[PDB]
């Protein structure tokens, strides 16, 4: 798996690719990585860009939970891995409550953060 340094490098590269497409500021992005979610459409659709980048989405605009679980195994430092997978399973009902794909990814991500704020990170 990656080390935390490697995981941050990977997340930084994803932020660098996605952030320019949206009106998202360092304050908003740093807060989001810290588990604080601005109610801002540009930030919602940034989360969807990241989810796509990360290979977690399907072409219907839903989160593929199976694929996400497999990425946690591949990528996350072991210590983050059971906790991330347990959070994903706990949060798998959230996306069904939202028609819009940027709501699905934003509110699903917020559910992961609320599950365990100490381990949560986001690009
Ligand atoms: C269940 C669930 C929750 C959150 C995410 C973000 C990475 C968007 C997922 O991919 C899957
Ligand atoms: Na857990
Ligand atoms: Na689901």
UniProtKB/TrEMBL annotation:
<dbReference type="GO" id="GO:0007608">
    <property type="term" value="P:sensory perception of smell"/>
</dbReference>
<feature type="disulfide bond">
    <location>
        <begin position="18"/>
        <end position="49"/>
    </location>
</feature>
<comment type="similarity">
    <text>Belongs to the PBP/GOBP family.</text>
</comment>
<feature type="disulfide bond">
    <location>
        <begin position="45"/>
        <end position="102"/>
    </location>
</feature>
<keyword id="KW-0964">Secreted</keyword>
<protein>
    <submittedName>
        <fullName>Odorant binding protein</fullName>
    </submittedName>
</protein>
<dbReference type="GO" id="GO:0005549">
    <property type="term" value="F:odorant binding"/>
</dbReference>
<dbReference type="GO" id="GO:0005576">
    <property type="term" value="C:extracellular region"/>
</dbReference>
<feature type="disulfide bond">
    <location>
        <begin position="91"/>
        <end position="111"/>
    </location>
</feature>
